[PDB]
Design a protein around this nucleic acid. Structure first.
Ligand SMILES: [K+]
Ligand SMILES: [K+]
Ligand SMILES: [K+]
Ligand SMILES: [Mg+2]
Ligand SMILES: [Mg+2]
Ligand SMILES: [Mg+2]
Ligand SMILES: [Mg+2]
Ligand SMILES: [Mg+2]
Ligand SMILES: [Mg+2]
Ligand SMILES: [Mg+2]
Ligand SMILES: [Mg+2]
Ligand SMILES: [Mg+2]
Ligand SMILES: [Mg+2]
Ligand SMILES: [Mg+2]
Lengths: 467, 232, 50, 53, 160, 75, 110, 128, 190
RNA sequence: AUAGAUGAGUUUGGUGAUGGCUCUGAUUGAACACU
RNA sequence: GACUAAUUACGUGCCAGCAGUCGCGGCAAUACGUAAGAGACUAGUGUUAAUCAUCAUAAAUAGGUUUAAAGGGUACUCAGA
């Protein structure tokens, strides 16, 4: 896409505020500050039409060597998207329903660009990050969390389905956490986002201004591979680490983590809830009864259609490509505008501000949906009316090229054991040495060895429990 | 540097005269400068005159001198091009050191470079003596058959020579329309017309017609050219 | 000026250029210092900026 | 012909690549040059008279 | 008045010579024009008008200044963010050309010649890195921005 | 002086790559790193033979070559 | 061969000895120093703002840098046992090899 | 100086420098004829020692100047019409002119072989 | 090969690390030759302060100064001291300097301008020796205030090391500094 | 009209400055001397 | 002699003389006068006078004034900037 084509595709449609996003350029650093603190920097049409030209333009030059996206306020980075407006437009006939589909087109176009960006992309998660704000960071190789970070996807509560590229991400995460975070719409605060795996680094909010100054000093050579450029930044972001809290323990770990892998491995919501009921039932061996009971209360308070549809793509999104995912999500989200749950949930929650009581999904509960009925299939059939989404480029892949910057997950610990003879204590030192003192590596690796590691041959060797 | 062999000069002569090929094509074919191709024809024409008038040529001197200079026989056995046919004069404006501050992501092209050097300057794409080559090379980038690429080249060059001849024809025909030839008993008076009001705004103009008033004879100045400057 | 011209912030720049080409024009430049590649991707921090 | 060309260049749109690669200067600073009279001037004077008294 | 631009040019030299991060300037319609030019050319970091104390550095661009009424116009001031790279200031010299004692004006034919390293009038050719700012009816443009717009006028300062 | 410019480069490229980077052109690794590398880097895009210096010094007595008597001696 | 020069100096009291740091910048050598509140930060390449008058902080900073070198030396030796040298012959010693072949070439012919 | 002080005429011409031969420089003449008034010997100053062959001459204008006689031996006496050219005997205060040797009455050195043009000596004509 | 039969380049052969045959291929010239004198208790003691430039012809130049009672020995000191002080000098298209430079050394100011190709070294005699030795071929210098032989060489040598770096100015301003001459000719015409 | 901007000798026991003098370039409606 | 391309011998001995500037000559003078050689221009070659430039050496473009030429004894103030 040339400058003229891009500039002509993102024309400043009437109503676009002039200073929605604030751009700045230092030496080697290009920044993008979402300037809408009143509404928690909520993404919308006007905001997306100002970022796409810049990102495309900054990708043609070799001067811009580091891209940084951040929020303007001190509470939120990008809390959701313009869900409220979509609902109104959806209630004005087909002409108004296609406007919403066009908005999702822009968002997916941007997310794909950020994911297939040819330059280092950093995102300061200094504040709550939900909905649209989850699409500007997850696909980046550097996602800096802070004390104020609050991660969640409260989209299944409004009838919608997590879709800012989540289908590519969540599936390909360690364990069944990705579905859990989507279906349950859990709330992760502070360092828990770092341990979970969403974020790559964890710095204090006060040390972000001094990080930008350093990122500007970095001047890479034109012959350095994309890997080298990322390595330099990764080592630079670790220079400002103040250390994870001393008291806060891994939230989703140990028992709770094991319970997630035992209740989020099936392909039917009915089976999943059936498993949770067992854990909730007193005397369960797991010891997660409290968590189990609490989880059910939240699962029985969301649109049943979204649950079925959401879980459906978690199993199908593990094989799609990033480019194919966005194209499908567009058609997928286009049918949600015509659905009744979405138009109802949004209006009854955000619009009404919770007045008139709880929302009223078209199916009252999962029990109403008979077993032999599959409602998921209908959405996963692109219609000819909605044209296929046209991305800004052709770059694609099956798995994230450089998503190794974060804390070691099960995939890393597993690989290490299958290529070495480390012990219980000697294996931890291996990862602490390779990462040279990354905060939380000793704790994270220890947790992995407390869930999928057995003392098969004593202290001499360590093997996985699966076998 | 090598010199066109005797047999080579004839090949260039026959191509232009017998086959009536455009000079630009013959130059691009054998990698010979258009200024040299035109000279070989002029020199060869004089030879035809000498042979037609039964004049003795300097064959003993020609053969002896040709063995002391490197030669480039054209045709089948062509190893290297005779010379560069794309040399562009280094204009004085283009020799300056200019670092123009532009946007970090700007696509600065030769067109923009010409405008930075000056306002009336052209890019090197228009200063070539055979500009049709660029158009011919653009066809090879579009996977156009070589045979058709040469066809377009010939037509382009051939069409260009027609325009040049037309302009030259109109010019000479328009220059003879201003001259009135009045034959007399002894001579033929040639009265040329011209606008007597084109003397600039202060009377000083280079292309004016008349002996200037207010100038003393400069015969006493140093380095005063008093020799013919051109032979027509 | 009782001080002296310190250039500790430009050791890489100066050294990198000196190791670009050889002093004997028409030869491959000899191997650079061992430290030139170590601090290649670690530029110094900005100083003296109130 | 020369007058239109010159008038067309002085009223031409800024280059696109120079619009997408410039730090954003807030409008409040770069365009609010007008200095209006204080709307609360009358209340302040009436309140300042008592204080001085 | 042109005396303001001269004071502004001299001040930015001293501020950069002292290696300061921020710099204050009297809030005037003229100073702002030249400041935007320096920013549009890449010499200064940011421009924000505020009170006698500098705004919150962390939120410089997010800083929302209050309206400039006749009740506080006397305390308003322009805060410029100086730029330094490679242990060297980016705004080293700001020699002025049009002083209060004489307003030097240049034509389009002279600016074209000065923008290629050739003297013309009371000016000198521009060398590598140097830059000239001319105040015209189209604002305080750069010599190369005024050449593409085919204008001329008052020459403010030569930026090296 | 003159400069040779082949039409091949003219067609493909329009001189935009000569400004990539910071204006002077995309930098390339030094000569001491290349020898260690097994595979050589891609060649830079430019006209053929566009780095040799032109001998201006050896043109002082060019005006004498226009003399009619010197031109005969050179023939 | 002429004597060696340090490829990196780690000073713990730049304020005291400025003659060493000046020779490093004069000979194009990087340096590391503990810059206090009254020490000129332009003397060393990499500053470490801290208290230099404390024998307890100096031991900590030096210890951390010591472990850095130790960890670095470990990787180098681990890469040398795999036939992967992380450094090429210096220019000085490199010249000797060239001269060695020249002297050896004579023996081949003669 | 300020632009105002220059409108008032603060840029005046530099103070003139005295010429080497004022009598000639004044009227822009390369030489002048004069009747010799006295033929004497002037003495050099601090560094130099010897006896210079000067001559008090009364130029056509009327000024009475002291010239210098270059060469070995002269042929002029009282009331001798001699041609005076510019110059100066550096080590002789008051002598700021020379005398052409091939002049009206002053005869060139007859025993001069080198630099005859400077002393007005015809070629020996040994063979011719 | 018996070239150094005086023991003068043996020490220099270690610092710079190159054969004597390559040391003798450098362009050396004595620019300044003063006759200084110091009044002491034993009478006047005259010395010969000399300045020698050791050039490469392809971008490297070095300035050395030394004094001694003997003029011959003073020249060897500056030569050895100048061959080891060689530094790379940036030069646009290997023929001229970048832009313009103005260096001041205690009352001696030198202004060097970058001239187009085919301009020649229209400079003074001392600058010519340095430009001819460093590898420059087109330059236009000027002594604005004073013409001290020594400071003239120090100021102009310090000016060739203070040329504006077009790449540092670009990263500083965030703007490209494109050489129009290179884009126009599709390369660098040396 | 885009190639056009240049120095040298001489103050001091010595160095760096200030500041003149002189030479280096071009020329004449020129004179003179030797030709 | 150096500036300034180009050397020895003899004669003279602060004498005779050369000299644009610095200077040379007091008994083995590369500087004076002869001889030879060398460097260079050439039907012209030198010298004298004058002009521009050198000279930012009256500086509008474009200077400077603590110790080097040069801040008024002072500041209220008309004109004027
Ligand atoms: K924030
Ligand atoms: K003297
Ligand atoms: K007085
Ligand atoms: Mg201390
Ligand atoms: Mg005297
Ligand atoms: Mg003789
Ligand atoms: Mg002076
Ligand atoms: Mg004294
Ligand atoms: Mg000589
Ligand atoms: Mg004589
Ligand atoms: Mg003699
Ligand atoms: Mg004649
Ligand atoms: Mg006083
Ligand atoms: Mg008085």
């Amino acid at each position: 896409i040339s400058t003229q084509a891009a500039a002509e595709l993102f024309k400043p449609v009437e109503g676009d505020e002039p200073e929605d996003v604030l751009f700045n350029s230092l030496y080697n650093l290009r920044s993008v500050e979402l300037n809408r603190p009143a509404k928690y920097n909520a993404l919308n049409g006007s905001m997306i039409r100002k970022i796409a030209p810049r990102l495309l333009e900054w990708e043609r030059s070799d001067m811009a060597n580091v891209i940084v996206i951040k929020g303007s306020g001190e509470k939120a980075f990008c809390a959701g998207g313009d869900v409220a407006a979509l609902a109104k437009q959806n209630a004005e006939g087909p002409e108004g329903v296609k406007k919403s589909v066009d908005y999702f087109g822009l968002e997916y176009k941007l997310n794909h660009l950020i994911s297939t960006y040819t330059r280092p992309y950093v995102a300061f998660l200094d504040g709550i990050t939900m909905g649209g704000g989850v699409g500007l960071s997850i696909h980046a190789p550097f996602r800096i969390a802070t004390e104020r970070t609050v991660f969640a996807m409260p989209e299944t509560k409004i009838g919608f389905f997590p879709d800012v590229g989540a289908s590519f991400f969540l599936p390909r995460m360690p364990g069944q956490v990705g579905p859990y975070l989507g279906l349950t719409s859990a709330l992760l605060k502070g360092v828990q986002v770092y341990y979970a795996g969403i974020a790559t680094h964890y710095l204090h909010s006060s040390s972000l201004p001094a990080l930008e100054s350093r990122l500007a000093e970095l001047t890479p050579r034109d012959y350095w591979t994309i890997e080298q450029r990322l390595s330099v930044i990764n080592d630079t972001i670790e220079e400002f680490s103040t250390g994870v809290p001393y008291d806060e323990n891994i939230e989703i770990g140990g028992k709770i983590r094991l319970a997630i892998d035992r209740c989020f491995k099936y392909d039917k919501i009915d089976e999943i809830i059936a498993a949770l009921k067992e854990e909730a039932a007193e005397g369960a061996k797991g010891g997660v009864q409290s968590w189990a009971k609490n989880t059910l209360e939240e699962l029985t308070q969301r649109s049943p259609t979204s649950l079925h549809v959401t879980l459906r793509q978690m199993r199908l999104g593990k094989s799609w490509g990033i480019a194919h995912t966005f194209k499908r999500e567009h058609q997928m989200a286009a049918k949600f505008m015509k659905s009744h749950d979405f138009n109802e949930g949004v209006t009854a929650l955000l619009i009404d501000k919770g007045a008139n009581g709880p929302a009223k999904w078209k199916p009252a509960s999962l029990d109403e949906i008979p077993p032999g009925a599959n409602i998921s299939e209908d959405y996963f059939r692109n219609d000819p009316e909605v044209p296929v989404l046209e991305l800004l480029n052709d770059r694609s892949y099956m798995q994230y090229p450089y998503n190794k910057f974060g804390l070691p997950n099960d995939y890393d610990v597993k690989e290490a054991i299958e290529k070495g003879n480390f012990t219980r204590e000697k294996l931890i030192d291996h990862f602490v040495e390779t990462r040279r003192g990354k905060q939380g590596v000793r704790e994270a690796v220890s947790d992995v060895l407390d869930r999928m590691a057995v003392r098969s041959k004593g202290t001499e060797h360590v093997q996985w429990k699966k076998e | 540097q090598p010199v066109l062999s005797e047999g080579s000069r004839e090949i260039i002569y026959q191509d232009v005269m017998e086959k009536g090929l455009p000079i630009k094509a013959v130059s691009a074919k054998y990698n010979v400068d258009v200024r040299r191709v035109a000279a070989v024809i002029r020199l060869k024409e004089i030879e035809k005159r000498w042979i037609k008038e039964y004049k003795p040529l300097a064959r003993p001197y020609a053969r002896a001198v040709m063995k002391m200079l490197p030669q480039t026989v054209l045709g089948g056995p062509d190893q290297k091009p005779h010379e560069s046919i794309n040399d562009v004069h280094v204009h004085s404006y283009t020799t300056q050191q200019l670092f123009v501050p532009v946007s970090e992501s700007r696509e600065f092209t030769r067109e923009d470079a010409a405008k930075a050097f000056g306002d009336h300057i052209l890019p090197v794409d228009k200063k070539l003596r055979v500009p049709e080559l660029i158009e011919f090379q653009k066809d090879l980038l579009k996977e156009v058959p070589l045979q058709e690429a040469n066809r377009k080249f010939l037509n382009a060059t051939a069409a260009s020579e027609a325009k040049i001849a037309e302009r030259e024809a109109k010019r000479r025909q328009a220059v003879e329309d201003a001259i009135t030839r009045v034959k007399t008993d002894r001579f033929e008076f040639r009265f040329q017309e011209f606008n007597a009001e084109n003397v600039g705004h202060d009377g000083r103009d280079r292309n004016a017609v008349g002996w200037r008033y207010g100038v003393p004879f400069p015969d006493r100045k140093r380095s005063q050219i008093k020799i013919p400057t051109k032979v027509e | 000026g009782k001080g002296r011209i310190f250039q500790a912030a430009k050791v890489y720049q100066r050294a990198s250029e000196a190791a670009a080409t050889n002093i004997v024009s028409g030869l491959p430049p000899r191997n650079p210092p061992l430290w030139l590649k170590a601090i290649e991707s670690i530029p110094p921090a900005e100083i003296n900026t109130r | 012909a020369r007058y239109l060309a010159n008038k067309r260049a002085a009223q031409a749109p800024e280059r696109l690549d120079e619009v997408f690669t410039r730090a954003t200067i807030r409008e409040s600073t770069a365009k609010n040059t007008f200095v209006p009279l204080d709307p609360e001037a009358f209340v302040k004077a009436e309140e300042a008279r008592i204080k001085h008294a | 008045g042109i005396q303001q631009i001269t004071n502004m040019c001299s001040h930015l030299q001293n501020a950069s010579r002292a290696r300061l991060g921020l710099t204050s300037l009297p809030n005037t319609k003229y100073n702002l024009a030249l400041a935007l030019a320096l920013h549009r050319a890449g010499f200064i970091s940011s421009i924000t008008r505020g009170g006698p104390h500098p705004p919150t550095p962390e939120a410089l661009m997010t800083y929302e200044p209050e309206p400039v009424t006749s009740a506080n116009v006397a305390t308003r001031r322009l805060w410029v963010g100086l730029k330094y790279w490679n242990e060297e200031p980016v705004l080293k010299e700001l020699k002025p050309i049009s002083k209060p004692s004489r307003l030097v004006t240049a034509s389009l034919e002279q600016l074209n010649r000065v923008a290629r390293g050739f003297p013309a009038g009371y000016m000198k050719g521009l060398q590598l890195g140097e830059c000239l700012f001319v105040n015209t009816d189209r604002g305080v443009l750069e010599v190369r921005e005024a050449v593409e717009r085919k204008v001329g006028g008052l020459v403010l300062c030569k930026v090296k | 002086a003159v400069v040779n410019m082949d039409p091949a480069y003219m067609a493909k490229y329009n001189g935009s790559e000569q400004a990539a980077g910071r204006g002077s052109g995309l930098s390339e690794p030094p000569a001491y790193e290349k020898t260690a590398d097994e595979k050589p880097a891609k060649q830079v895009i430019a006209n053929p033979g566009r780095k040799v210096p032109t001998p201006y010094e050896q043109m002082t007595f060019a005006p004498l070559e226009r003399r009619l008597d010197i031109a005969i001696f050179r023939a | 061969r002429r004597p060696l020069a340090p490829d990196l100096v780690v000073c713990l009291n730049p304020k005291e000895n400025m003659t060493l740091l000046y020779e490093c910048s004069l000979a194009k050598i990087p340096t590391i120093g503990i810059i206090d509140t009254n020490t000129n930060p332009s003397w060393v390449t990499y500053q470490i703002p801290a208290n230099d008058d404390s024998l307890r902080a100096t031991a900590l900073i030096s210890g951390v840098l010591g472990r850095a070198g130790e960890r670095g030396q470990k990787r180098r030796l681990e890469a040398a046992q795999r036939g992967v040298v992380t450094w090429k012959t210096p220019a000085d010693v490199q010249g000797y090899f060239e001269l060695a072949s020249a002297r050896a070439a004579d023996a081949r012919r003669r | 100086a300020t632009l105002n002080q220059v409108m008032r005429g603060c840029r005046k011409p530099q103070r003139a420098r005295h010429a080497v031969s004022p009598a000639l420089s004044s009227i822009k003449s390369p030489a002048l004829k004069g009747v010799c008034v006295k033929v004497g010997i002037t003495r050099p100053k601090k560094p130099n020692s010897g006896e210079r062959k000067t001559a008090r001459v009364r130029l056509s204008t009327g000024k009475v100047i002291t010239a210098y006689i270059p060469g070995e031996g002269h042929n002029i006496s009282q009331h001798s019409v001699v041609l005076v050219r510019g110059g100066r005997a550096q080590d002789c205060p008051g002598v700021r002119y020379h005398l052409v040797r091939g002049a009206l009455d002053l005869a060139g050195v007859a025993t001069r072989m080198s630099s005859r043009s400077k002393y007005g000596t015809k070629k020996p004509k040994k063979a011719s | 090969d018996g070239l150094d039969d005086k023991g003068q380049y043996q020490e220099l052969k270690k610092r710079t690390g190159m054969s004597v045959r390559q040391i003798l291929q450098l362009k050396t010239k004595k620019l300044v030759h003063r006759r200084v004198v110091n009044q002491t208790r034993l009478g006047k003691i005259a010395s010969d302060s000399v300045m020698v430039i050791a050039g490469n012809g392809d971008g490297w130049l070095g300035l050395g100064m030394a004094k001694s009672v003997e003029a011959s020995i003073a020249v060897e000191k500056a030569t050895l001291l100048a061959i080891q002080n060689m530094q790379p000098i940036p030069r646009y298209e290997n023929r001229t300097i970048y832009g313009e430079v103005t260096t001041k050394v205690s009352g001696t100011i030198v202004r060097l301008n970058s001239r187009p190709p085919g301009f020649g070294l229209r400079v003074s005699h001392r600058i010519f020796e340095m430009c001819r030795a460093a590898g420059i071929r087109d330059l236009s210098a000027k002594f604005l205030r004073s013409r001290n032989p020594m400071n003239t060489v120090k100021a102009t040598y310090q000016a060739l090391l203070s040329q504006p770096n077009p790449e540092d100015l670009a990263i500083g301003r965030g703007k490209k500094l494109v050489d129009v001459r290179k884009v126009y000719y599709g390369g660098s015409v040396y």
